[PDB]
Structure formats: structure tokens, C-alpha cells
């Protein structure tokens, strides 16, 4: 028995496994339960703390993936499959993972907590691109990731009800955060230095923890990659949630109590079968069961909360990739496919816009088309295709991020912002998709450091830079290297100068204004136009 | 006659004329100035269509400019050349329907292409006798025959009670039309070719040229057209019948006045009383808006200019159109607070929003917001230099650049041959401040060739530049193409098309071809704004 691999937590004893990273061993404790399985009558309910166990719990392997829809658009294609569950599906899924240096840190070490994305309907902490061994080995970090309930299981809500209050998937995350506070010291983690980071719906989750008081004592700094709590997809009102839940119940053949009781009799796959059928419009970048503005977890809309919050003791790193919108086009916009160059017509552009901005009035959709049309080349299919991608990325990610960065900075937060512009040499999606949503993650987690993965040498060097910025940020709230002169420094994002940096193979370059003109259209004009209808 | 110069005696349909020999830098020219082309539109003829001048006896002296049509006189900056050069330079009178002819001396032996100038001035001012419209240089250097006419402006030319017999509207345009008919009948007496007539005008004169293109009875009176910084479409050049009726009747009230009775009472009023109140009838505080302009009467204009350029067939037409680099700037000192010729006019964000309401006076609150959001620099939203230049651009784009873009595109799509330009050289002799850039109206002195006059103090390069522009304009008049055939070396001026949207820059450097005339911004003005203000 390796003493490094044996740990006592409040619930009892755990046995981890020694893993191999390129530069040395790491200790991994995988599949640690942090909650009572949310099964049977506990479906849709807030999580409860895991009961203590006897003997030594085996934590040498990843646990089950929370029950979820599985992407089958391109069967066996690497680009889709790498996001799909890589362990058995189960509602019994509330487990977390810890990687630490081997031997375990002599002094309390900064902790990073990862929260996966996947539209709040999918994802798992066990995916290869979330492998924490590189950050632990190279940077001596303690890295944590948890599973949380997705889809109906995590976010179906009859607001006001006792038994389906909503946001229970965010409560799972929070319970894992509490677990880190109470237990991470046993692994050598420093509970007084905890940084949340996440991507897409994971980033929106992080933002929701920033905006919800009981979460605030559980972390100190946050990183939001390609996602925000504000914006068009990350939340629904109480009314729309109630509507969606009642429709789903109707669809599976199901007095909130009676309705929820009947939903609890249904096999998991029956719920998943109908989950996509409750969206009000044909759309992309829209998800059926997401966090709900409940007046509890979220005391108000994220927009209202970022406008009035006090964020003076907060540091945040936020950013986007160069082509946020591109991969969403192939899941519902006619004319777009991964298997050709997706050269679309003007008609397909206008139709694409109604799907990418499903909430738009005729006039709003016209404003969008006119803004994104290149009037020198109004019919050029290459411009129209790239414009369609920009519409989706700007509306769903870039402009919401620019808005959040500006509000946080105006309200006293220390903010750093980036645009990630390197396309992985190993990417299997076609060239026209550019640097797609999600494809910065492998570099931040340090996967290029594994020779067997076939990244280039420049990519290994680049990944090492990114691991440094992220862990520097975790340690200090500043991604700049504490020692090491030779610039250029990454300056804070401010409302005055709006500075951000490009992350690519070349040295940091500083830019000003994150799509400032176009985001002014989305953030300032669109709302008025929509209200005026 | 007996000892008079034999080259200066000419007969026209109405009688004999005696002209005068003028000195141009390169040699003499013939001028016949103050030729009546209509009965004086005075007394009971005020507000009425012009009647053709009745023959006179003896030799009419045509050696000096005639009266300027009664009009408001600009007094914002007293004694300042920048405003004075546009002011009347002959006596104001309702008896003002006269035209002017310059020709080579001695007169051309074979029929020469004719250029006809129609001045601007917002349809409320202007005169064919201003120094900047002097035809002697074009006549002398290019051998052109040049005509310019006075037409009624303000209430006298444009006050309308649509449907009445006594004040049908558009009579200033009918004054112009009558001058064009006069050219058809008489210009051959001067060596001019009635089968080659090119209209050109600036601002309201350009809008006028546009209206002759759109009005069938004018179409037989000219062959080609040049529109400088103005268009018949757009927000200022026409009013609906309803709005014209409303303005005429408010004006009648203001001066103490059944259409027949109202109009008869207006006819008893002193010309100057009409002028003193004309500005009081605009529906909002504004700039680049004028009280009495062409009206959509269903007669001269059978429909709005926008509809007529949308559905017209313009296959037999060649058109040259363009704009100066800073159309909007000088309009800002006549009514946007924060703006002045005498300082840098750095304004605040608040003054920008207020200026937008004045510059787009028809805008709803949301439309105004769209304009502000579009023109704001979101990296420097409060920067006074950017706000100042953005205010200028709002005014220039809304009133001139985008209406021109819309016109060029429609004309081309519908068969016309179109050439487009942007004029970018600021006269070295300009008295307006630098921040105004290359302001509205300041290409004119170059087209007419004033820099050839040594006493005007233009630079040598400006002299050469002026000669190039005279050439482009006269080549265009002669053949419908600004390019010189006997010179394939010089860069070519390609036609404007919907596909490529080419236009050229006019400056001291050789022609440079550019693409898209403020294409993104003009899509906002021409496609989106209309939909936004309906909603
Ligand atoms: C649609 O689902 C794809 N997907 C789902 C979850 C996380 C990432 C992704 C794609 N990343 O490129
Ligand atoms: C005021 O009217 C002057 N004006 C009248 C007609 C044409 C141009 C101009 C001024 N250009 O700067
Ligand atoms: C690319 O593939 C899609 C899906 O089959 C097809 O509809 C489209 O026509 C192809 N390319 C284009 C944009 O024509
Ligand atoms: C320029 O002059 C005008 C009128 O005198 C004035 O309103 C404006 O404030 C001045 N601008 C500045 C900044 O001096
Ligand atoms: C031209 O230059 C001369 C020499 O200084 C000057 O006396 C004259 O006033 C100038 N003319 C004009 C129109 O400015």
C-alpha cells in the first residue's frame, strides 16, 4: 500500500491511484462520492451530503456520467465523439475527482476547480480533454472536477414547488465546492485559495456562483471561458421553465406534486427522448433545461445582478475563441455541414439568422442581416457563411462576454480578457470552422505535453505558456509571471481602454475593444428594437 | 449698329441682342448676359407658371447680369468671404427670369456641345450671376457654349396649394424648363448644338437636374446630366402635397392671409414679408431642411422621386454624379449648438445627441438612437474630436452621400451609364476652418476653372487640377464619357455598376479607383432607417 495514495476525508478513507504524466507521477483520486445518489424520489431534488462509509473506498477510476442525451450526428467522428460520455450513463453520478502532485504538496497549494460545459444537457468530468494530471505535475496544482446533473435531471423546474425547485444541477456544483472547503486540505490543497474555471455552460455556471451569495464563501477567483451567466441561452424565467416542464410532462403522459411524482416514475431515457421537443422555436445554441431565475439561487436576472453587484474583492479571467459560432451551424442550419465548404446563398443566410436568433422579430432579424451583410459583396457565399458563424458566436458568446467584462470592471472587479486564436494541428473539423468553440481547452489542460498525442513542438510550448497564465492567475489573481521581466504584460481589462490579449503561437499582443461596434448593436440596440418589437 | 463689334450682334426668337467681349486668361470670349426668357412673374403672375417672354423691339443690351430672384440673404458671418460669395450680387427683384450665355470668340463655326448650369442654394436662394458660376473659362479653354438661368426660389418658386390653378407648385422648375426650351430654339444662333445638351448643377441645382430626368416633358430638352452633391431622392429635395399645403397655409397665416382667396391675399403681400417668414414654417428645429421646395404634385412629378427612380427605364441616359469629402460640415454652424467657424467645435456627447435630433429632424426616438449607436466610436464614446466629425458625417451621409449612392445604384440597375466621383481637394484659398475639411460647394470653383485666373491666387497645381476637371466635364458633355480617347496612359474612369460600385477620387494625384460609396453606412440609411421609422 502506497501511503501517498491513501487519504482520510470527513466521510472516511479513500485509495487513489498513481498516474504517469510526461514529467513524473501524479496522485489521482477519481470517483469520490460527494452526494447521496439523486435517484428514485430524490430525482429533481437538491443534493444531500454523502453518508460516511466504512473501510477504504476505491477511488482509482472515474465514476458514471450523469444521464444525458448522446450526440449521434456524425457516428464515430472524433470531433463529436470526444464530447460524448466515455463511461456508463447513470442518474447515480454525483462524484468528483482530485489530482495532486506526487508526493503530495508539502505546503497548502492553490486549488483549481473545473466545471465542464455541454449546454447544461450534457458533459462529464471524465473526458480526456479535462485530464488534470498535466496541471498537477507541471504546475504543482491541486485540480478538482465534479459531475453535476444535466438536462431535466439537473434543471427541470416547477418554480415554487417543493420537489422540483430548479437549479439542482448548480446545487450539485455548490455541494462539491463545500466538499473542497472541508476536505481539500487532506490532499494538500489550500481551501483559502480556490479558483473556479469552466467553459461554455461551465463558464455560465461559474458566473452563477459569482452571482449567488451562498457560493461566494466557497472560492476566491474565477475564469469564464467562452460563456457567461448573462446572455440569451444560460437562463430562463420562472414562467418559461414552468412551461417547458409542464410540456415535457404532457409529452411523457403525466398539483405540482402529482406532476412531479409522475415524472419520477419515468425511466431516464423517456425524459431524454422528449427533452429537445420543448423549445419554443427552431433554434441553435438554445437548450431546454437550464438554470432558472428562481428568486432563490438567482435573486434576479443575471443582467440585473451584474449591473448592481459589488465585485470589488473579485478577480476574473474571461475570454472567447476566434470562431465561437462555427460548430453550431451544422446542428440545425440548412446549408451547413462539416463535409463540404458550406458555401451558402443569401436566402439561406436570412433563414440561418431566424434560427440563430430565434427570439427576433422580423425587424430585429432584418437589423441583424443588414449589419452582417457585406454590402460590397452582398451575395458572396464565403462572406455569407462566415457572417452566419459570426452572428451565432457574437450573439451567444462574444458580446455577452464583452458585456460581463465591462460590468465587472465598472463595479470594482479586477478583470483580464483574451481571444484564443490558435487552431489545433490535430483538429478534425474542416478548415472553414476556423478556431472552433471548445478547442482551447486541450491547451489549457496541457494535453500537448503528452508526446503520444501528436501535437507540434510549438504547440507544446504554447500549452506550457497557457498553463502558466491560468495557474499564475489561480495563485495571485494575475496571469502575469511574478518574476520575468521581458514583456509584453497582459493588462487588466477596463471600461476606459478595453484592453485584451491574443493567445496564439506568437508573443502576447494587446488589442483594444472586443468587437466594440458590433457588440454595441447586440448589447445596446437589439434590446430596444425588440421591446419596440 | 455701324461701329459695334460684328461678333457681338445676335438675333433670337424674341429679337436682337448685343453681347459683350470678355477677357479670359487665354483670350477673349463672348458673353450675352441678362437675356429675358419669360414675362416678368410679378403682380398677378406671382406663384404662377412662367409665360414665354414676348418679342421686344430694337437691340436688347445683353452686357450685364440681370436682377437676382427675391430671396433670404445670409447674415450669420457679416463680411466673411465664406458666406458672402454665395449671397446675391445684383438687385433682388421678382422680375428676375433671365439667362446668360458664354461662347468662344469669335463664335464657333460648327455646332458646339452645350452645358447648362442650374445653381443650388436649398431652393430658397442662389443666382446664375455669382463669380463661382462664371462660364468664361469653360468657353475659352474648352470651346464650350455655356448657359445659366435664374429661376424663382423660396415662396415665389415653390409655395404650393396642390390642386389649385393659381399656385400649382414647382414653378421654379418650370422656370428652368422654359430656359431649356429657349436653348432648344435659340442656342444655334450662338454656335451651340441643341442636339447635344448636358445639364449640370450642384446641391438643389443637382436635385433640379434629377427632377428633369424624372419629368417626361423635360426629357426631350437635354441628352446627358451631371449631379454634383445633390439628388431628387432623399430627405430635403421634395415634400408631399400634404406638407406643402400645410406650409403654404401656415405662411399665409403668418403674414395676415378657399385657395383662390388665400392665394389672392398672398399676392398683395410685399415680397420681403414672404421672405421674412418663410423659415418659420418648418415642422421641427433642423438643418439641411428648406421651407419651400419641389412638391410631389402628381404632375411635374408623377410620383415620389424614390418610386420614379425605382421603376424608371434609364437606358438612353448617361449620368455623372458625385460628392465632396465633407458634405455635412458647413451645415453644422447654421444651427447645431457647439459648432462654429471660429473655434475647433469639439463637442460633448450631449451635444452630439442633440445635434442628431436636429440633423435628422424626422426621426423617432428609436431611429435617433440607431443613428447615435451607429456613429458612436465605442472605444472612445466621449471623445470630442470624434463626436464633432461624426456629427458632420451624419449630416453629410443622410442628406447627400447616401441619396447619391442610392441614385447611382438605381440608375445603373435600370440601364443608365453612370460615372461617380468623390472630390477630395480643399482649396488653398478656403476661408472656412480646417476641421470643416473639403466642404459642400467647394468643388464648383474648380469645375468652372476659376483657378486659371492668375489674380485669384490658387497654386500652380490647382491650376492644372482645374484643367483636368474641366476636361472630364466637357468630355462627358461631348460624348457621355469623362475619359479622353486620345490618352490611354492616364488612369481610366470606369462606370459605376451595381456589381463593382466603382468611383474615382478627384484630387491633385492621378485618378484612383475605389469601390463602394460608404456601402455599409449607406445600407443603414437607405435600407434600414425607412423600416425603423415605420415601426
Ligand atoms: C453540440 O454538442 C457538441 N459539444 C457539446 C459539449 C461541449 C462541446 C461540444 C463541441 N465542442 O466543440
Ligand atoms: C448657405 O448657403 C450657401 N450656399 C448656397 C448654395 C450652394 C452652396 C452654398 C454654401 N456652400 O458652402
Ligand atoms: C454541404 O452539405 C449539406 C448537407 O448535405 C448540403 O445541404 C449542402 O448543399 C452542401 N453544400 C452547400 C452549401 O451547397
Ligand atoms: C465655439 O463657438 C461657439 C459659439 O461661440 C460655442 O457655442 C462653442 O461652445 C465653442 N466651442 C468651444 C469648445 O469653444
Ligand atoms: C492675392 O494675392 C495678393 C498678394 O498678396 C493679395 O494682395 C490679394 O489680396 C490676393 N487676392 C485674393 C483674392 O485674396
Residue numbers in the entry:
A (entry chain B): 4 to 257, 265 to 543
B (entry chain A): 1 to 257, 265 to 542
Sentences from the paper on this structure:
The final model of HI-6•sarinaged-mAChE contains well-defined atoms, namely, the aged sarin and the HI-6 oxime-pyridinium parallel to Trp86. The carboxyamino-pyridinium ring of HI-6 bound above the indole ring of Trp86, HI-6 molecules bound alternatively, and the side chain of Trp286 were omitted from the final model. The occupancy of the oxime-pyridinium ring is set to 0.7 and the occupancies of the apo-like and HI-6-accommodating side-chain conformations of Tyr337 are set to 0.3 and 0.7, respectively in the final model. The structures of HI-6•sarinnonaged-mAChE, HI-6•sarinaged-mAChE, and K027•mAChE are generally very similar to that of apo mAChE. However, relative to the apo structure, a large structural change of Trp286 is seen in HI-6•sarinnonaged-mAChE and K027•mAChE; Trp286 is disordered in HI-6•sarinaged-mAChE (see below); minor structural changes are also observed for Tyr337 and Tyr341. The loss of the isopropyl moiety in a small fraction of the aged enzyme provides space and negative charge to accommodate the cationic pyridinium-oxime ring in the vicinity of Trp86 and the aged sarin, as supported by the superposition of HI-6•sarinnonaged-mAChE to HI-6•sarinaged-mAChE The aging half-life for sarin in mAChE is presumably close to that of sarin in hAChE (∼3 hours), and we found that the half-life of sarinnonaged-mAChE in the presence of HI-6 is ∼4.6 minutes. An HI-6-bound mAChE conjugated to an aged sarin or a non-phosphonylated mAChE in complex with HI-6 is not a complex at the Michaelis-Menten state (hereafter termed Michaelis-Menten complex), as it cannot proceed to the transition state. Aged conjugates are resistant to current oxime reactivators.
